[PDB]
Design an enzyme around this catalytic site. Sequence first.
Site, PDB file in Angstrom:
ATOM      1  N   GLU A 123       0.817  -1.213   0.000  1.00  0.00           N
ATOM      2  CA  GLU A 123       0.000   0.000   0.000  1.00  0.00           C
ATOM      3  C   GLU A 123       0.848   1.258   0.000  1.00  0.00           C
ATOM      4  O   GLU A 123       1.527   1.536   0.998  1.00  0.00           O
ATOM      5  CB  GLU A 123      -0.949   0.032   1.206  1.00  0.00           C
ATOM      6  CG  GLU A 123      -1.910   1.238   1.133  1.00  0.00           C
ATOM      7  CD  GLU A 123      -2.990   1.270   2.206  1.00  0.00           C
ATOM      8  OE1 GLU A 123      -3.038   0.373   3.075  1.00  0.00           O
ATOM      9  OE2 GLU A 123      -3.822   2.215   2.174  1.00  0.00           O
TER      10      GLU A 123
ATOM     11  N   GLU B 259     -11.503   1.770   4.509  1.00  0.00           N
ATOM     12  CA  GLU B 259     -10.479   2.074   5.506  1.00  0.00           C
ATOM     13  C   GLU B 259     -10.569   3.562   5.791  1.00  0.00           C
ATOM     14  O   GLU B 259     -10.392   4.374   4.877  1.00  0.00           O
ATOM     15  CB  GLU B 259      -9.063   1.728   5.024  1.00  0.00           C
ATOM     16  CG  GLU B 259      -7.970   2.182   6.013  1.00  0.00           C
ATOM     17  CD  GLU B 259      -6.568   1.807   5.559  1.00  0.00           C
ATOM     18  OE1 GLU B 259      -6.022   2.496   4.661  1.00  0.00           O
ATOM     19  OE2 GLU B 259      -6.028   0.800   6.078  1.00  0.00           O
TER      20      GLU B 259
HETATM   21 MN   LIG Z   1      -5.532   2.113   2.925  1.00  0.00          MN
END
Ligand SMILES: [Mn+2]
Lengths: 263, 264
Positions: free
Chosen positions: B148, B242
């Site tokens: 990420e 998220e």
């Molecule tokens: Mn994320």
Amino acid sequence: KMKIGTQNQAFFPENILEKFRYIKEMGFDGFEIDGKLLVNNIEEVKAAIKETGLPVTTACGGYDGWIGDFIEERRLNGLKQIERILEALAEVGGKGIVVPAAWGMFTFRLPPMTSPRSLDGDRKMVSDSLRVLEQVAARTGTVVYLEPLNRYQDHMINTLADARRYIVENDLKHVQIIGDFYHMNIEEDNLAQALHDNRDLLGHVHIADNHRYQPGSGTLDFHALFEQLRADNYQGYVVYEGRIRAEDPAQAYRDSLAWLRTC
Amino acid sequence: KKMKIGTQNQAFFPENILEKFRYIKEMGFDGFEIDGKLLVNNIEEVKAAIKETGLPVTTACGGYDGWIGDFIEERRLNGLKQIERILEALAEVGGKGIVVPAAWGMFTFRLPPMTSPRSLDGDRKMVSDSLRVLEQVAARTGTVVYLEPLNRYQDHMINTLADARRYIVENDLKHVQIIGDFYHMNIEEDNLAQALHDNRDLLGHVHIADNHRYQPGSGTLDFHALFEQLRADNYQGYVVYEGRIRAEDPAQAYRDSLAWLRTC
Ligand SMILES: [Mn+2]
Ligand SMILES: [Mn+2]
């Protein structure tokens, strides 16, 4: 037609007169100067404004001590320095100084996660600083432009509504909001709507693309936001604040400005 | 055309694992992205909850102490051991892989201190070594590592999809894929839809939040345009919440955002 200015960049000429000439020929309408460069070179700046016709619109930075500083001595020293910057702005025809509550001092979003001061403590110190600067601004005929920064750079003022609260709740008449497209792209629910809802207090604008680089190198809808400012009859400048990502910085800067002229 | 939409845990979710899975399924989500430590310490409970509810664990995120690019070598190595256990747990419950950044909250070039204690080549060597090691575990367990990029304030090492692509391509990794996070991408990418398109060969997972990290629909991100890009690129993964919630009634705002998202 928007009035478009810029802060200094490292590839600009160092000499003040040459710097103003260089900024003018790129096509910019004004120069947002470092506060310490201004104060230490008032006559040189006055000369350069006269010879080139490029005005100093505003100052930004140039003082040591944030208006919301955690350390009281630093806050108070910063206010003394900001006063000198406002005096210098009046002497060269600048409109005012851009200040955040603080930069790089604290953020709720990265360790250390716990602030050493309460939220009420933040508000009291920022409010007191703005009340002091209101007195100087009234004397000098200048304005303080209060800038919300994104949550990583400052914990105290992140949205236009945050800055509005300080101005309205202290009933300040010489403190206006400065909206920065880059910070707003992170913090606002709706950028154009935030510009509209605060048109009564929006006195200055900073522009950069979504990744802080030169306008047009990202995907911020500069045309839409410029249309919003036009619909609101925005009177001020939009000023480049940010970085440059390019093999040829000067050419990318000129190209970005030329592209902005079509927005 | 419809997307598979999951979520990480939120504070207002039930703490009991079975109840939490029930609750997430009832709000309408298609999967759960679980904390790695919660998963490892409660594998049987998680397996029971998946079976009873039909709500899968799609992925894990977090749950280890020590970043794959950690400045402290002992922490990096301890983190790899913990991530290995998380990948094993994922294989046992049918999850696809673990989401990891290079680091979070360790260093940024953009806030003081301004000088990194490690060279760029040192960053690259540590992250690359970590990813090789995890590549071996991923091959053994049949899982994936989703790398990420985070925005420049949260991590100095990997900020754009192209940064993550470098690491994958230059190490010739076959079990490390890119995870794009709409919130981070909104800061770092030149063009979000183009970035999703140019990396469709390696994009294996997606994180979603609005531009200010709050629930989708409470900001300005054009989720419809981005879901259209994913559909055009034949994306077959999940898009997973998220982020944070700003609302008087968090549970209701969460439901409302998902209902709205189903129209994009
Ligand atoms: Mn994320
Ligand atoms: Mn700014």
